[PDB]
Amino acid sequence: GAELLSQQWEAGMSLLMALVVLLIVAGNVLVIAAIGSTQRLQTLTNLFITSLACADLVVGLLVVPFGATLVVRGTWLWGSFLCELWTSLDVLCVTASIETLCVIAIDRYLAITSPFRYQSLMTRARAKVIICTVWAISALVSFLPIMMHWWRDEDPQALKCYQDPGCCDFVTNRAYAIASSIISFYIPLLIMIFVALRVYREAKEQMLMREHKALKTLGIIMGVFTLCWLPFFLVNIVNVFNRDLVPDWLFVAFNWLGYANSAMNPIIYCRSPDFRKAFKRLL
Ligand SMILES: CC(C)CCC[C@@H](C)[C@H]1CC[C@H]2[C@@H]3CC=C4C[C@@H](OC(=O)CCC(=O)O)CC[C@]4(C)[C@H]3CC[C@]12C
Ligand SMILES: CC(C)CCC[C@@H](C)[C@H]1CC[C@H]2[C@@H]3CC=C4C[C@@H](OC(=O)CCC(=O)O)CC[C@]4(C)[C@H]3CC[C@]12C
Ligand SMILES: Cc1cc(N2CCNCC2)nc2ccccc12
Ligand code: NA
Ligand code: NA
């Protein structure tokens, strides 16, 4: 009865989780393989896209599988170390994603307002340093505070969860919830929106239709990212002030909306003929 109902749900979620993993992994391997095998797609801007595919690949290979086992089985099967590692990797990927989008927006702004200054400043070696710096900074604000337990709360509910090896809820204190959100998400979001609007304005004051079509693609990956993660991070803050005003399962839904973003960019890149061709060829 209870057991048949469990077996039905377990089986069904496991397939659905498999699908989501497969979509995230296939899509982002395709983006990486496409850019890595097509001279025409080997632009500096696409180096930044590859970094973003790596973030999403890590979400499909490590973040989502582990979270799937949690949703499907109803406890954490892997112990407390792996629970902390997993949470770290989760925070890392979101931070790395939005910081990279931020860089992309700035890269385009420099390209569009000062194409010559850009041509000579911006090389492959620098693109590389930029990408490493973004991962450095993301690692710094993800791993270290989590491995220093700066996120832990005194509350008994929180304490219940920490001793329990089957609980891997990321139940944090309020200072971390606000700090972490601002540092990992809100600040880079405001930077990206500010620079993205300026790129819009400069594009309006301006082969042109083709360039703009690629800008619009970047604009779409930025907007869909915002739509997918903003709700989660708004709710994160709201909870700090009032635990009860937003229902818990919708806090979970918004988290999964966020994870689902990692499957979206490869689809969105099908707006481009060059990507579409390299995808067909590769498959
Ligand atoms: C488990 C967690 C900690 C995974 C962390 C992996 C990172 C170290 C990955 C994610 C994105 C990767 C980057 C994505 C893309 C590139 C472009 C790649 O090729 C080039 O930029 C041109 C170099 C050349 O022409 O040889 C150089 C490595 C680099 C920076 C990668 C270096 C390794 C990065 C930072
Ligand atoms: C490192 C750079 C990128 C960040 C620069 C921003 C900081 C100078 C300021 C801006 C907003 C400030 C935050 C605003 C609100 C809070 C909540 C505050 O204290 C509480 O939340 C008490 C609640 C409780 O524990 O009951 C903790 C510090 C923090 C994150 C502040 C820490 C310092 C912040 C991040
Ligand atoms: C920055 C940040 C991320 C985060 N994720 C864990 C759940 N999966 C989505 C990402 N959770 C946080 C919780 C508190 C503060 C900051 C967080
Ligand atoms: Na992402
Ligand atoms: Na625990």
Length of the chain: 283
**Does any ligand 2 atom lie closer than 6 A to the CB of residue 179?**
yes
Of 283, 86, 113, the closest CA to residue 169 belongs to 86
**Does any ligand 3 atom lie closer than 6 A to the CB of residue 186?**
no
**244 known member of a binding site:** no
Q: Mention every residue, 6+ apart, whose C-beta is less than 8 A from residue 91.
A: 142, 146, 180, 184
Alpha-helical segments (H) within the chain: 2-37, 44-58, 64-73, 80-113, 115-121, 124-147, 156-163, 174-181, 187-205, 208-241, 248-260, 265-268, 273-282
Two structure tokens written together for 42: 């080997």
What span, in angstroms and rounded, lies between the C-alpha atoms of 102 and 191?
7
Atom 7, ligand 2: residue with shortest CA distance = 179
User: What is the 243 CA–ligand 5 centroid distance (Å)?
Assistant: 20
Residue with tokens 């579409």, as numbered in its chain:
276
Atom 14, ligand 3: residue with shortest CA distance = 177
What span, in angstroms and rounded, lies between the C-alpha atoms of 83 and 76?
8
Amino acid symbol at 7: Q
CATH number for the domain harbouring residue 120: 1.20.1070.10
**90 known member of a binding site:** yes
**14 known member of a binding site:** no
Which structural domain range is residue 247 located in? 1-283
Q: How was this structure determined?
A: X-ray
155: Cα separation from own chain's centroid = 30
Q: CB 199: neighbour CB atoms within 10 A? A: 22
Of 278, 222, 241, 257, the closest CA to residue 97 belongs to 222
The per-residue DSSP string of 88-150 comes to HHHHHHHHHHHHHHHHHHHHHHHHHH-HHHHHHH--HHHHHHHHHHHHHHHHHHHHHHHHTTT
Q: How many domains, in total, are found in the chain?
A: 1
| Farthest-apart Cα atoms in the chain, separation | 70
Residues 70/160, Cβ–Cβ less than 8 Å: no
Q: Which residues surround ligand 4, an ion (CB under 5 A)?
A: 55-56, 97
